[PDB]
Amino acid sequence: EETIPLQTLRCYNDYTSHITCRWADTQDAQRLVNVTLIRRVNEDLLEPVSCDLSDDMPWSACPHPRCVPRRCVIPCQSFVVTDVDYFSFQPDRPLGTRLTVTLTQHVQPPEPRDLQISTDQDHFLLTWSVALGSPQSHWLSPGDLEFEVVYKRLQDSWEDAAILLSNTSQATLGPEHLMPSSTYVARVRTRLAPGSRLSGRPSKWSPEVCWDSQPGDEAQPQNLECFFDGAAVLSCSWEVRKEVASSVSFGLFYKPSPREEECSPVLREGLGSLHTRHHCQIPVPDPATHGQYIVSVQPRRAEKHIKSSVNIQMAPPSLQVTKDGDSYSLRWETMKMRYEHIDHTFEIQYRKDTATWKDSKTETLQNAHSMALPALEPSTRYWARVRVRTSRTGYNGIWSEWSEARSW
Amino acid sequence: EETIPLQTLRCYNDYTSHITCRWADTQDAQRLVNVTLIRRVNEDLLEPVSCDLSDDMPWSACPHPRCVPRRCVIPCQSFVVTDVDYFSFQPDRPLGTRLTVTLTQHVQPPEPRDLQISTDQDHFLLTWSVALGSPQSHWLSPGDLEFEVVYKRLQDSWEDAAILLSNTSQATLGPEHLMPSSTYVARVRTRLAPGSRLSGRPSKWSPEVCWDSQPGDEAQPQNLECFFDGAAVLSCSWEVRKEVASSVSFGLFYKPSPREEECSPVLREGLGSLHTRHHCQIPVPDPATHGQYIVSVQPRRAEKHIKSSVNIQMAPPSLQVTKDGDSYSLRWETMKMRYEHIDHTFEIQYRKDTATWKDSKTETLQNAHSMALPALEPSTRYWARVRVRTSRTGYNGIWSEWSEARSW
Numbered sequence: 160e161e162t163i164p165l166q167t168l169r170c171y172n173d174y175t176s177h178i179t180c181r182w183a184d185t186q187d188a189q190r191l192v193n194v195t196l197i198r199r200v201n202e203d204l205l206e207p208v209s210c211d212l213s214d215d216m217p218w219s220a221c222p223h224p225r226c227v228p229r230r231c232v233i234p235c236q237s238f239v240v241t242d243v244d245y246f247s248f249q250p251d252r253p254l255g256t257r258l259t260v261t262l263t264q265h266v267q268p269p270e271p272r273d274l275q276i277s278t279d280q281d282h283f284l285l286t287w288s289v290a291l292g293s294p295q296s297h298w299l300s301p302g303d304l305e306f307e308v309v310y311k312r313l314q315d316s317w318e319d320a321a322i323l324l325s326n327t328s329q330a331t332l333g334p335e336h337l338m339p340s341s342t343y344v345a346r347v348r349t350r351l352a353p354g355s356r357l358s359g360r361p362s363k364w365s366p367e368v369c370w371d372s373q374p375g376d377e378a379q380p381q382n383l384e385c386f387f388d389g390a391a392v393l394s395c396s397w398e399v400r401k402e403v404a405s406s407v408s409f410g411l412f413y414k415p416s417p418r419e420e421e422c423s424p425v426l427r428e429g430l431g432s433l434h435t436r437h438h439c440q441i442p443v444p445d446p447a448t449h450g451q452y453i454v455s456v457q458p459r460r461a462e463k464h465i466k467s468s469v470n471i472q473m474a475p476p477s478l479q480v481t482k483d484g485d486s487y488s489l490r491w492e493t494m495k496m497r498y499e500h501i502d503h504t505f506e507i508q509y510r511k512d513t514a515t516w517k518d519s520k521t522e523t524l525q526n527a528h529s530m531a532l533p534a535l536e537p538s539t540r541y542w543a544r545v546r547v548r549t550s551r552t553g554y555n556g557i558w559s560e561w562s563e564a565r566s567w
Numbered sequence: 568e569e570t571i572p573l574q575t576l577r578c579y580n581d582y583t584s585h586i587t588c589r590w591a592d593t594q595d596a597q598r599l600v601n602v603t604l605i606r607r608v609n610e611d612l613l614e615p616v617s618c619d620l621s622d623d624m625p626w627s628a629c630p631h632p633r634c635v636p637r638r639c640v641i642p643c644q645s646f647v648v649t650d651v652d653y654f655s656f657q658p659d660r661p662l663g664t665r666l667t668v669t670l671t672q673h674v675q676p677p678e679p680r681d682l683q684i685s686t687d688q689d690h691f692l693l694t695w696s697v698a699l700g701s702p703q704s705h706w707l708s709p710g711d712l713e714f715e716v717v718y719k720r721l722q723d724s725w726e727d728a729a730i731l732l733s734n735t736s737q738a739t740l741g742p743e744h745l746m747p748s749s750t751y752v753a754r755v756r757t758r759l760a761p762g763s764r765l766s767g768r769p770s771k772w773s774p775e776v777c778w779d780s781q782p783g784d785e786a787q788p789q790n791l792e793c794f795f796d797g798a799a800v801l802s803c804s805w806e807v808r809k810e811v812a813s814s815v816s817f818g819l820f821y822k823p824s825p826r827e828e829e830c831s832p833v834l835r836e837g838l839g840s841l842h843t844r845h846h847c848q849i850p851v852p853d854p855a856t857h858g859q860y861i862v863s864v865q866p867r868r869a870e871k872h873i874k875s876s877v878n879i880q881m882a883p884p885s886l887q888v889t890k891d892g893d894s895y896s897l898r899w900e901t902m903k904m905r906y907e908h909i910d911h912t913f914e915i916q917y918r919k920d921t922a923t924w925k926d927s928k929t930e931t932l933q934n935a936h937s938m939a940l941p942a943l944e945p946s947t948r949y950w951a952r953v954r955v956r957t958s959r960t961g962y963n964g965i966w967s968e969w970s971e972a973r974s975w
């Protein structure tokens with residue numbers, strides 16, 4: 160029985176005139192409350208029990224960290240078969256609190272249920288019911304309640320609390336509330352209408368209902384909330400699809416009509432995965448002179464500069480092998496660039512129909528058109544691969560594709 | 568450059584008439600937006616680039632999980648030293664959002680700071696400041712702001728939102744707000760007073776400040792919130808110290824004056840360790856007839872029933888050994904219970920000054936007053952231990968304490 164002294168309390172007696180009780184108390188509770196053991200004589204005869212400190216706890220164990228075991232001895236209660244006496248623990252001082260709850264001034268309406276939303280062309284009718292009672296209990300009538308519905312998206316926190324109310328168990332959520340492609344969530348609480356019984360906290364929020372809003376254009380930026388700070392900065396809370404942002408880079412432009420178009424910083428802050436909001440701090444030195452700033456969010460002119468003379472890649476040359484006296488040479492099909500004087504480095508590769516290109520000889524030289532070699536008894540061995548590169552101060556490019564293995 | 572296609576885009580050409588570009592797109596973004604590569608001719612000549620799908624990505628790598636590599640070929644742009652052409656990516660459809668912002672109607676006041684609480688006899692002065700600007704910026708004057716302070720205890724959630732307001736940067740929190748021994752927490756937000764500039768969301772809550780409230784009586788029950796449900800039940804939200812509850816068991820009593828005192832269920836719900844709240848559902852069939860219920864929370868009648876004949880423990884008997892002819896016997900000092908006929912079982916124990924009680928012989932018998940034994944050459948050996956128990960239908964008790972070792 161929870162209470163420690165009760166929990167650990169065993170009273171052993173002998174059919175003579177000696178009944179000992181052993182219980183304990185927690186040393187912590189001691190500095191707040193102290194209790195005295197009490198025996199039930201017959202009824203209003205709550206005769207107290209004398210108890211002296213003890214160190215040992217044999218009859219029962221104490222589940223506390225620091226207990227104050229006690230041993231109590233009580234006199235002849237004249238033992239006889241079927242004799243039961245009750246023990247209680249009386250606190251040193253009267254404890255408790257009271258509260259006169261005048262029903263009317265402490266009413267908490269029941270929570271709504273059967274929350275459902277039926278859409279009707281970019282409009283959502285949120286319906287619900289409330290179990291008032293059974294026999295027409297005139298105490299509380301539906302005309303005594305008020306409803307507070309809160310709604311948001313399956314992303315943001317309820318702290319933004321976009322509330323709405325109704326005197327009927329129905330609300331009309333539309334385009335002027337929800338935004339075009341977001342999945343919303345809403346719940347309802349039952350309040351006490353001004354015409355009422357009296358005060359009382361409103362019910363607890365009902366289960367929330369989820370639904371997708373009006374069809375819209377995804378892959379578009381949303382929530383262009385811009386809030387003017389004091390009198391020097393204007394912060395805007397951007398919002399774009401975490402997939403569009405990986406193909407379309409957007410920027411925040413602003414023009415105070417009656418033009419500048421970017422901010423020094425555009426910090427990205429990841430939202431609920433599916434979305435990534437951005438921020439920018441637009442400076443505003445003349446708030447009085449220019450109190451109109453039409454901000455916009457469109458594709459930022461993001462371009463990659465490619466320098467021709469640095470991103471070169473020549474075409475693979477031809478080879479056609481020549482064999483006079485002792486086969487060795489290799490022809491270089493230089494793609495005659497119109498009288499353009501540029502140095503070229505080549506990479507020729509050896510081989511054999513019995514080996515892979517990973518074990519070839521790569522003689523790399525400049526402005527050459529052939530090389531030397533000492534073959535063997537094979538005359539159907541592969542060994543024709545040539546790469547060209549810009550080995551001039553026309554600084555750089557990339558290895559050209561390979562030529563073709565002229566099986567000789 | 569962030570955008571994947573831009574990030575992974577290399578365009579290699581040959582000083583002839585063949586420039587190939589290779590970029591990729593993320594398969595995910597594809598079902599939302601599609602982009603087309605574009606080359607910058609000179610200015611407004613944004614000539615598009617044709618691109619066909621590819622499977623290989625050599626020139627650059629794609630940091631995505633599933634990419635859509637593409638290979639694009641573009642014609643003679645007549646290559647010559649110092650020739651740079653820019654590439655961009657154009658989305659299939661115009662994307663963007665606009666917002667005409669009028670500073671006055673979109674003002675978000677700065678957040679308060681230097682939040683501190685000075686106590687003054689069961690009163691706490693909450694002070695704070697607000698950085699408006701530097702040179703007297705008449706746009707926003709302190710007489711344009713309003714303050715909303717919220718407070719609670721270091722336990723409950725802010726949803727209960729016990730709000731308070733002020734037209735000055737100061738609030739007087741007192742006994743009629745806070746409760747007598749709880750550690751509170753409060754924060755402030757800056758709103759726009761009705762006399763204002765215009766609409767705008769208030770600032771973001773400032774850092775919270777924590778402080779302990781007025782001194783009081785701990786080890787007492789608090790928050791006796793009782794709320795009437797519809798018209799049949801009345802729930803009360805109890806609250807007691809998680810230390811007192813282990814020595815003092817409380818109950819919820821109720822009497823509709825102008826008596827019943829307990830509920831069938833008193834469910835315990837652990838709070839912030841230091842406290843343990845309870846609940847009870849008081850039934851109320853006549854709300855109109857009895858709209859007055861004075862509830863109370865005081866020490867409950869928790870008693871442990873101890874049945875004498877079941878919690879027996881006899882007294883340790885004497886032994887005084889007898890040695891005639893051949894030492895063996897042992898005397899039983901039966902504490903003559905006044906002509907009470909009850910059966911007793913005893914436990915005698917052997918020993919020696921050279922051994923411990925864990926290796927003794929325990930002959931257990933009924934209504935005996937001695938036993939037999941064959942000693943040895945020792946005459947100073949310990950062996951006197953006797954327990955008594957109730958071996959009758961006076962059902963139970965506990966082994967009595969031991970007797971005394973009559974060293975014979």
Ligand SMILES: *C1O[C@H](CO)[C@@H](O[C@@H]2O[C@H](CO)[C@@H](O[C@@H]3O[C@H](CO)[C@@H](O)[C@H](O)[C@@H]3O)[C@H](O)[C@H]2NC(C)=O)[C@H](O)[C@H]1NC(C)=O
Pocket residue numbers: 189190191192193251
């Ligand atoms: C239940 O009874 C116990 C005593 O059996 C109470 O504890 C006792 O509390 C007093 C005052 O709080 C302690 O005495 C003080 O001791 C200091 C020196 O340590 C001295 O400066 C003071 O003048 C005074 O003598 C007393 O020692 C302490 N006893 C024990 C055993 O700790 C306990 O407070 C009672 N419970 C309640 C709720 O009152």
Ligand SMILES: *C1O[C@H](CO)[C@@H](O[C@@H]2O[C@H](CO)[C@@H](O[C@@H]3O[C@H](CO)[C@@H](O)[C@H](O)[C@@H]3O)[C@H](O)[C@H]2NC(C)=O)[C@H](O)[C@H]1NC(C)=O
Pocket residue numbers: 597598599600601659
């Ligand atoms: C960018 O272009 C690609 C195509 O190259 C677009 O994906 C294509 O989308 C259509 C319709 O969403 C897919 O066709 C449909 O296929 C199903 C069978 O799978 C059939 O029932 C339909 O009648 C229709 O033919 C098409 O297969 C798909 N192509 C690929 C390669 O997946 C993509 O949507 C475009 N991006 C945007 C934002 O529009």
Ligand SMILES: *C1O[C@H](CO[C@@H]2O[C@@H](C)[C@@H](O)[C@@H](O)[C@@H]2O)[C@@H](O[C@@H]2O[C@H](CO)[C@@H](O)[C@H](O)[C@H]2NC(C)=O)[C@H](O)[C@H]1NC(C)=O
Pocket residue numbers: 324325326327
């Ligand atoms: C129940 O609600 C309707 C409609 O809504 C609310 O009315 C105000 C309380 C306002 O603050 C908004 O929340 C809603 O518009 C109430 O009907 C309106 O009553 C006013 C006159 O007081 C009238 O000018 C409007 O045209 C009415 N609107 C409609 C749609 O008929 C109605 O009075 C509420 N019931 C009670 C008992 O207050």
Ligand SMILES: *C1O[C@H](CO[C@@H]2O[C@@H](C)[C@@H](O)[C@@H](O)[C@@H]2O)[C@@H](O[C@@H]2O[C@H](CO)[C@@H](O)[C@H](O)[C@H]2NC(C)=O)[C@H](O)[C@H]1NC(C)=O
Pocket residue numbers: 732733734735
């Ligand atoms: C600034 O606050 C003081 C005191 O508080 C608020 O007044 C109301 C707005 C009310 O809803 C409560 O929040 C506070 O009491 C305002 O002074 C009170 O003004 C009324 C008359 O309008 C007067 O009867 C009270 O006695 C005044 N209280 C005190 C303590 O002097 C004060 O007007 C507020 N300033 C502005 C510009 O509104």
